[PDB]
Amino acid sequence: RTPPTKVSILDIAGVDDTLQRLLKEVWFPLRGGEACEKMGYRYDNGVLLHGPSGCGKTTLAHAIAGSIGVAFIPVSAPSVIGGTSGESEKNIRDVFDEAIRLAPCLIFLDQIDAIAGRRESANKGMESRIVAEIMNGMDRIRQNTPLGKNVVVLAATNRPEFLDPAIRRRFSVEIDMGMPSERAREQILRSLTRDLSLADDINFKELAKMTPGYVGSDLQYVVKAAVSESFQANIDSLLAQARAKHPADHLANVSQPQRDWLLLEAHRDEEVSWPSTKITMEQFRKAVSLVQPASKREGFSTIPDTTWSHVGALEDVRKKLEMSIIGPIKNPELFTRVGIKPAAGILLWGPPGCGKTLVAKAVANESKANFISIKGPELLNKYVGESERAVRQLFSRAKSSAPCILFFDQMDALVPRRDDSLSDASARVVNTLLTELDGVGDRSGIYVIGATNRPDMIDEAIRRPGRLGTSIYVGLPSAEDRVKIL
Amino acid sequence: RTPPTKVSILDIAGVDDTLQRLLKEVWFPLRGGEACEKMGYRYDNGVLLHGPSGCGKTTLAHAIAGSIGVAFIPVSAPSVIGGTSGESEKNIRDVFDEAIRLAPCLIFLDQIDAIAGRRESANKGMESRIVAEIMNGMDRIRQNTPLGKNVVVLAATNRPEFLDPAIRRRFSVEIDMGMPSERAREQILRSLTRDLSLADDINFKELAKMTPGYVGSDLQYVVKAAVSESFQANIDSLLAQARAKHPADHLANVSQPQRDWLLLEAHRDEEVSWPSTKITMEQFRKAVSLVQPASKREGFSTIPDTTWSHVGALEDVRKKLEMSIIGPIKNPELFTRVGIKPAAGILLWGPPGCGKTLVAKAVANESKANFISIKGPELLNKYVGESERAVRQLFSRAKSSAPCILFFDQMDALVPRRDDSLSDASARVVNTLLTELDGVGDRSGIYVIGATNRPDMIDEAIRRPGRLGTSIYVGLPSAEDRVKILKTLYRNTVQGTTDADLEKVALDLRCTGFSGADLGNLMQAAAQACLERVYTQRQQKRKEGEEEIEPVITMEDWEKALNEVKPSVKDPEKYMHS
Ligand SMILES: Nc1ncnc2c1ncn2[C@@H]1O[C@H](COP(=O)(O)OP(=O)(O)OP(=O)(O)O)[C@@H](O)[C@H]1O
Ligand SMILES: Nc1ncnc2c1ncn2[C@@H]1O[C@H](COP(=O)(O)OP(=O)(O)OP(=O)(O)O)[C@@H](O)[C@H]1O
Ligand SMILES: Nc1ncnc2c1ncn2[C@@H]1O[C@H](COP(=O)(O)OP(=O)(O)OP(=O)(O)O)[C@@H](O)[C@H]1O
Ligand SMILES: Nc1ncnc2c1ncn2[C@@H]1O[C@H](COP(=O)(O)OP(=O)(O)OP(=O)(O)O)[C@@H](O)[C@H]1O
């Protein structure tokens, strides 16, 4: 026998539309069993949950089980596999047999790509046999159903492409647990904070606003990070206290971390009372700085200490830049009300060493937004199909986490190979680039900045509005400006 | 002992020709056993059923067993495998032994590729041994047959290529359970609806007509979807009822889904009576929209909210497009009667940012048909045999589900590498493409649209009729058109609309030498200048003197923006001549 678990339903939020759909599909067959039997009509059998890792797929399933109050049978990816070639199949049968016998129940298949991958990618005679066992089980359920058997099969996967097209057909209902919004993040923050004693200066709304590409798991961690930051006061207190009980003069010290460690080791059986302190908004900001956006292993470059005070003159350019980049990031409300779409990109052109690279970083800094710098030919490969795939990947990464400034330094290499027929590799790359800039999808938050020391040989197609339309000239010929720089 | 099951024979339909053949081959040996024994003539032993998953292979077998009334022995793929190396073989023997002893019977081998795959692909000593056991069993049946033994071996598989050529030879009769037609779908719908109380407004014929690439399993689901949609009224009723029994004020709510859940949890042992309601045609349409064609894994790019109202002018082009794409999709009757074959493809060529990509989407939307967009080089791999295989796969997917528009953006890359000998990889891909277009696979429903900013270097072979013959030029040089575009852009704002201002702006010399992209930029520039005015004025007044924000845009803003902005495209001679 396997009874349900006690998990908090008030923990998951930001999934309003999806949870509603799930409720509709699952509530009627499980709760009103007598009604469905009398009518004779057939219902939903399989529900597949997809999306990235840590999106709360496992939690959602657990929550749903507890909330409804039905029997939960957890089937993890390697829990059914045995030692001998036959025990694995026997177990699958027993699972389905006990499940159909006892009702109402929820069978949860966590991480299904490990059990049922594509049968062409699996050259083993055991793996193909397991897929077959699952298929047989599915059919048995369908036949037994009109009597009084009520079982819904839930499943969770991280990638739909790895799954066998055959099982995809068997499953009917699909729910996409993707990326959260401003409102959604706010809700998630509230769910996590629920057990904590927050101070009056904390505005969860402000946190959510200034939290771009963070997921449910990331926000969970930000909360945990804040907890550790607050308890630093208690550490300092203990250090001072320890140095008074056991002085040890200057024999216990060679460095700072080592001395602290030694004092604690000496104490051992000393129990201390910890006061319950409240968290500040400053502590949260500190916690946020030290957190990774889950997609840290990327082309993510940190913003330098470059401000407007480092740039002498160019006040006109500064204002123009503020309008384009800082305008949409800081004031989305203003842009939506007036009626215009947010910017796409700008081009910095002129003589070498005039501050083009600095300006790009400076703007990114000011906006407190992310910055990625791809210089010259750091894209091209020796192979016929990795360069284009890589460019696609960059835009995908950018789309996932916004606000970000995408900087392209020295574009004089890639762009002129269009007007005159030369190479085939160069042709493909530039065409993919044009496509990524102007084509299907590619929303705002991502502002592309291009820079070149040579504006001469460049294709007009790239210059066209919607791609890189705002041509900003960076030059230096005046006296007043020079004094400011000095 | 294993007696037959009670499955509905009135559930499967659309398999008229195939079911007839099956009946002929299976009826005589099973039903008239005395007659065959007397004659001394030999009959059919093995019947193999093939086709895609969920095609009703298992059901057909079950149905046939029940209908005839013979003994059913179900042999599933892993049901015979044991623990020790010998039990598996012993079981296979016992199955065949009991089967020959008791007659008339139907042995059904469900999913056979898991038991008997190619012996070269199986490096295990057990798998090869199992194939041998099956072969031995087959021979034993043949020898025993002239006495009074009547057993027919049915089998189901999803792929014929994975099966061992040896067993293929052993099996004599083969039935292909493929895809349905308009008439067939109608029949399937009726089979499923049989137990439901349909309303008078429901026309199953209309549903079937507007259901392109759906299979037996898909239609089954559409019916189930409708059931769930109807029972939403009961959910609303329960919600209102619950909030009256247990109010809980405003403590039970943080959001909407959570509050609903909590109320139900509180009730538990409360039984409610559900009224039997009828379904509407509207509910079916809603259900259809939310369903997947089981081939959603493909690369199903959804159609945007782009209509003809979003495109300023180009009325001539609009009509031409309607003729070619909407003509065959909406009116197949017209085309069959006149005598012409449906279209294959069109080419959109001209200056950048003139609405080529938009047009493609717009047409797809209008037809309510599917849309796939492959841009530049999203096909090529680093390996020597995946690029060509992928292209083949795209056409296969398109063939399976039609109506669909296949869009190729920026063809200037793939096409010119023919006229001059350069790369080998590029050569193979383009040749495969030409083959897919003209070869044998172009059975309509699939309309290919190509777009290029550079019509110059392209191979004439691709341009040839039957492939991409309809060359449509997308350009922009007139006053009336510009006014329409300006109105279209300034249409999407939400008081002050001002029509006179728009016309005057168009008249100016600077505006004459512009394009669609330029006009869009001008609009944005004007908006930015207006914001500057609002910010400077508001801040000065608020600090010295909180007031209201004014989003209004006048002519002074337009004039200043107009003065500064310069055009993008310079020489039109390049595009026109080449
Ligand atoms: N949407 C969310 N709301 C609140 N908490 C979340 C959310 N997503 C994840 N978490 C936190 O992160 C943890 C991981 O969730 P879970 O394991 O369900 O994610 P997952 O998508 O199933 O990951 P995987 O599929 O890789 O196992 C949870 O225990 C929860 O505390
Ligand atoms: N206005 C400026 N203020 C401060 N430093 C400057 C300025 N202009 C140029 N420099 C110096 O020149 C260097 C290069 O600046 P940057 O790279 O931004 O110029 P550029 O126009 O991109 O030309 P290039 O990168 O080709 O030298 C910087 O390290 C900086 O110290
Ligand atoms: N042609 C059809 N007509 C009516 N219903 C069908 C048809 N095909 C499938 N179904 C429905 O879908 C279910 C699945 O059918 P079945 O399992 O026989 O398909 P299959 O081709 O054997 O799949 P697999 O071979 O992968 O097991 C049936 O129980 C039936 O209700
Ligand atoms: N007639 C038009 N109506 C509305 N928008 C237009 C029009 N022409 C161009 N545009 C704008 O230009 C952008 C690009 O349009 P589209 O991609 O269809 O042009 P194209 O001819 O394919 O050239 P490219 O894609 O190379 O810029 C769109 O986002 C759209 O806002």
Author numbering:
A (entry chain D): 193 to 678
B (entry chain C): 193 to 686, 712 to 762, 768 to 800
Study text:
Rix7 is a poorly characterized type II AAA-ATPase that plays an essential role in the assembly of the large ribosomal subunit. Rix7 is a type II AAA-ATPase, composed of a unique NTD followed by tandem well conserved AAA modules known as the D1 and D2 domains respectively. Rix7, the earliest acting ATPase, is proposed to drive release of the essential ribosome assembly factor Nsa1 from nucleolar pre-60S particles. In summary, our work establishes Rix7 as a nucleolar molecular unfoldase that utilizes the D1 and D2 AAA domains to thread substrates through its central pore via a processive hand-over-hand mechanism.
To determine the full-length structure, we utilized single particle cryo-EM to obtain an electron scattering map of a Chaetomium thermophilum Rix7 double Walker B mutant (CT Rix7E303Q/E602Q) and derived a structural model of the hexamer. The EM data were classified and refined without imposing symmetry which resulted in one dominant conformation at 4.5 Å resolution, that contained well resolved density for all 12 AAA domains. The electron scattering map revealed that Rix7 adopts an asymmetrical stacked hexameric ring configuration composed of six subunits of Rix7 (referred to as protomers P1-P6). The cryo-EM reconstruction lacks density for the entire NTD of Rix7 (amino acids 1-192), suggesting that this domain is flexible and dynamic. There is sufficient density within the pore to accommodate a ~20 residue unfolded peptide spanning the entire 80 Å length of the pore across the D1 and D2 domains. Five of the six protomers (P1–P5) within both the D1 and D2 domains grip the polypeptide through their pore loops, while P6 does not contact the peptide. The Rix7 cryo-EM structure reveals that even in the absence of the aromatic-hydrophobic-glycine motif, PL-I within the D1 domain of Rix7 (h-S-G, where h is a hydrophobic residue) grips the polypeptide. We defined the P6 protomer as the seam subunit because it does not contact the polypeptide or closely pack with the neighboring AAA domain thereby creating a seam or break in the hexameric ring. In the D1 AAA domain, ATP is present in the nucleotide pockets of all six protomers, whereas only four nucleotides were observed in the nucleotide binding pockets of P1-P4 from the D2 AAA domain. There is no density for ATP in the nucleotide binding pocket of P5 from the D2 domain.
